[PDB]
Design a protein around this ligand. Sequence first.
Ligand SMILES: CC[C@@H](CS(=O)(=O)C(C)(C)C)N1C(=O)[C@H](CC(=O)O)O[C@H](c2cccc(Cl)c2)[C@H]1c1ccc(Cl)cc1
Length: 89
Amino acid sequence: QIPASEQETLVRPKPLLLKLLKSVGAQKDTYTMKEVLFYLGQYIMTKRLYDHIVYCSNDLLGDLFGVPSFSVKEHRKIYTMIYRNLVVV
Ligand SMILES: CC[C@@H](CS(=O)(=O)C(C)(C)C)N1C(=O)[C@H](CC(=O)O)O[C@H](c2cccc(Cl)c2)[C@H]1c1ccc(Cl)cc1
């Protein structure tokens, strides 16, 4: 029960989120939430942090989100953790 519109939001990552995104995607100043979620998704799968829990205490992603692990099924929490690392444009 998250709206579809949320993936349209325009955002400006803070430096550490930007560092992580640069490892998987082109470097722009502005991203859609859709893009951010995809890049983070690819980052996680590429680095195999996920086998419904993502484990990230041995990874920069852990520092980014402030948790050692999280559930992929809890989307509102994920959006919340993402939002602390960006500015809405
Ligand atoms: C790395 C985990 C990826 C995998 S996936 O969708 O890309 C695929 C099934 C294609 C392999 N992921 C999920 O597995 C879960 C699947 C689900 O529980 O519905 O969806 C995650 C998702 C999608 C959209 C928004 C949010 Cl906040 C999270 C989504 C996700 C979780 C965390 C982050 Cl940071 C980004 C995307």
